[PDB]
Design a protein around this ligand. Structure first.
Ligand code: TYM
Ligand code: O9F
Lengths: 333, 321
């Protein structure tokens, strides 16, 4: 059998070009080379408070968007997290092998706490442990994620090693698969802050389901720098906005940084923003054209969730049975 | 019938104070209420312990509760890990529980020890629980469960019952043998307590060593302030035999504390004979214990699945196919 790939995304907010290039692009390319399992993590999404109707719609939006990117249901397992009970079951067990200090020092908890001061809930604090359960359930070898999830992934490795040291080879120790380009896609009007899928200022974001014409106007108004003459060169410290635009172009087209610098030799930020606007608009037009065809076909979406949760439960139950045997519970019969 | 929920830890060796107190109280109320006993193996793992002893202790606790008089036909009795819904609801309730609330409960500690009160709330709220018997140490945990229930209900309508504490205490007093001011608790000093599995010889040894007083002449009379040791032995004997305190004072008229101790040891062992006989018979019947665990999990999961479905429908999750 092939090595196993696992990853997930929250059905909350509107998934961006950041979410695509950091995770979903890699998900589609790994499907033949590895046995891939992709999850709509609705149990994680509710750590930030959601409208009930908006959550349900977002789950089905996210599933249709996976399919629009090229996530084949005949190649990969595609499921909703809450449909497999073993994620919560293993999650509780892994709380008992996760330290308090590890969770409190997490960057995602600190930033999300400051952002949602009125709802610093226990789920938001306990986010990483359920994520470790999501990965460890399927004997996962590779985990394709963006730069922001590096810390959470290191904990999953530490938990897997900590549990295996006491009980034997029950889990596989997962490894990160973070890409070279597009691992940390930044905000258009604030290049130092990463692109959010629920930004209060919409002008920071390039949404995947967003109107192409609106996205072109956003790329044109992206902040750059005061350099005289203007020069298209990758430099995150000095030229954060220009570098973010180069990073976005490189990932859509496939061309490298020095290739693009040579292409924009003797050119200025008009040529740069024109190429990003054209490249990104053609991507989103093609993607949204496939999306609605998937999203309005409810019988098809229902079948994908049905088959995916069924495939996932087989893997999940086997791992949880071994966990429960090792920690010393009386086996269910 | 109101629904009652009790979490039974698979770790401690139950005492006669546990038995004659709350447990014997509840054995006779199994037709009055819908009693649910959950052996909480998922709570146990918050403290790191040997795996094989945990599996043993779960079956020990199951057999002992069954031996004490819990009826699988009348009451639902099950292992916590056999019902996935506990873990499922517990994660949901994490998202509607403040971080501040858990930190306000009175680095190197594991996240389970920090977060078990939310699981403890899910344990109760899954079964539409009306009454929850608790000690002083678990009063804060019940209060959180009620706050979570009201918080969730206020957003999404009446999904959960707001549970109440079961107020009335047992009536049987059982204090520690070498410290009669202190209540007998399943204690580091094991000569303070009488376990339910102890043979007659061990009961004679512990009751003999139990403190009394230096009254001259020695007089068997009830007095908690002055004669704490002698009073505890009378309450133990009264709890076993059902005789009143004034009757026993007349029964031990002109009698020394050696006579009292002899009767207390005989009486307690007489109670523990029928109890231990039932324990060892149930504990070593593997098919019987497996059938009780299957039926109880099946009864529990029917209740639990209905509540979780209403919770999941209210939160807005896409329903399982
Ligand atoms: N500005 C950005 N630039 C580049 N990449 C980004 C940007 N923002 C987000 N990402 C990546 O997109 C994925 C989805 O993020 P979510 O917030 O939906 O969701 C998350 O951040 C995960 N915790 C969901 C999850 C739950 N369980 C798991 C198990 C394995 C892997 C992932 C998961 C992520 O891979 C994230 O790294
Ligand atoms: C890490 O996932 C978790 C799963 C379950 C719980 C409960 C039962 O409170 C908490 C956390």
């Amino acid at each position: 059998t092939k090595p196993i790939v696992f990853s997930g995304a929250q059905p909350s907010g509107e998934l961006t070009i950041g979410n695509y290039m950091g995770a979903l692009r890699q998900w589609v390319n790994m499907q033949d080379d590895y046995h891939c399992i992709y999850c709509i993590v609705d149990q994680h999404a509710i750590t930030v408070r959601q409208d009930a109707q908006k959550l349900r719609k977002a789950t089905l939006d996210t599933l249709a968007l996976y399919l629009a990117c090229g996530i084949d249901p005949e190649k990969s397992t595609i499921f909703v997290q809450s449909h497999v009970p073993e994620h919560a079951q293993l999650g509780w067990a892994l709380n008992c092998y996760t330290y308090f200090g590890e969770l409190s020092r997490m960057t995602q908890f600190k930033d999300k706490s400051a952002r949602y001061a009125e709802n610093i809930n226990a789920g938001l604090f306990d986010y990483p442990v359920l994520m470790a359960a999501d990965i460890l359930l399927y004997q996962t070898n590779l985990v394709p994620v963006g730069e922001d999830q590096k810390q959470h992934l290191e904990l999953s490795r530490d938990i897997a090693q900590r549990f295996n040291a006491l009980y034997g080879e029950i889990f596989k120790v997962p490894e990160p698969f973070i890409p070279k380009s597009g691992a940390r896609v930044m905000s258009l009007l604030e290049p130092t802050k990463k692109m959010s899928k629920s930004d209060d200022n919409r002008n920071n974001v390039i949404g995947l389901l967003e109107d192409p014409k609106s996205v072109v106007k956003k790329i044109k108004r992206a902040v750059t720098d005061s350099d005289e003459p203007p020069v298209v060169r990758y430099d995150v410290q000095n030229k954060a906005g220009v570098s973010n635009l180069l990073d976005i172009l490189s990932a859509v087209t496939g061309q490298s940084i020095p290739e693009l610098e040579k292409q924009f030799e003797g050119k200025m930020y008009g040529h740069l923003k024109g190429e990003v606007a054209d490249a990104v608009s053609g991507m989103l037009t093609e993607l949204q054209e496939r999306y609605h065809r998937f999203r309005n076909d409810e019988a098809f979406l229902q079948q994908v969730m049905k088959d995916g949760a069924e495939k996932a439960s087989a893997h999940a139950s086997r791992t949880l049975k071994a966990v429960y045997e090792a920690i010393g519970f009386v086996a269910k019969r």
